[PDB]
Design a protein around this ligand. Structure first.
Ligand SMILES: *[C@@H]1O[C@H](CO)[C@@H](O[C@@H]2O[C@H](CO)[C@@H](O)[C@H](O)[C@H]2NC(C)=O)[C@H](O)[C@H]1NC(C)=O
Ligand SMILES: *[C@@H]1O[C@H](CO)[C@@H](O)[C@H](O)[C@H]1NC(C)=O
Ligand SMILES: *[C@@H]1O[C@H](CO)[C@@H](O)[C@H](O)[C@H]1NC(C)=O
Lengths: 56, 49
């Protein structure tokens, strides 16, 4: 739920009716297929909250 | 509030209980079906009394 937005330099996801930017993560989001299909997709990092623990 | 039209249609798909990747993956087909369906409105009204 929410929409991807940028302030010009950084990418966030907000709920749609009130500006509240969240850092984009694998639990803010879901995957479907690959980048070649979608008209206007943008290149970015998605943070995975498990990776700091696997970095122990 | 402006929003891109394909991104508004992705909200209309969530509103019927279809996950929005279904629109972004099928976007040209969905656009052609709409454009073709509006063409059938012209041809019906430009013919039927
Ligand atoms: C876009 O939003 C980010 C919010 O993180 C801004 O970057 C932060 O800027 C403050 C100072 O304004 C710094 O203290 C933070 O460390 C920055 N965070 C990061 C991740 O670098 C960014 O300045 C905003 N851009 C514009 C054009 O407004
Ligand atoms: C958006 O419009 C610009 C011209 O205004 C065009 O160059 C660009 O390819 C378009 N991008 C998408 C995602 O449709
Ligand atoms: C996005 O990333 C891929 C892989 O790094 C690259 O091939 C592609 O050209 C990039 N696209 C844009 C719009 O930067």
């Amino acid at each position: 739920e929410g929409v991807f937005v940028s302030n010009g330099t950084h990418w966030f996801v907000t709920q749609r009716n009130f500006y509240e930017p969240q850092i984009i993560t694998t639990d803010n989001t879901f995957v479907s297929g690959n980048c070649d299909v979608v008209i206007g997709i943008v290149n970015n990092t998605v943070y995975d909250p498990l990776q700091p623990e696997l970095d122990s | 509030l402006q929003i891109p039209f394909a991104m508004q249609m992705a909200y209309r798909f969530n509103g019927i209980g279809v996950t929005q990747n279904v629109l972004y993956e099928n976007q040209k087909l969905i656009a052609n079906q709409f454009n073709s369906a509006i063409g059938k409105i012209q041809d019906s009204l430009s013919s039927t009394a």
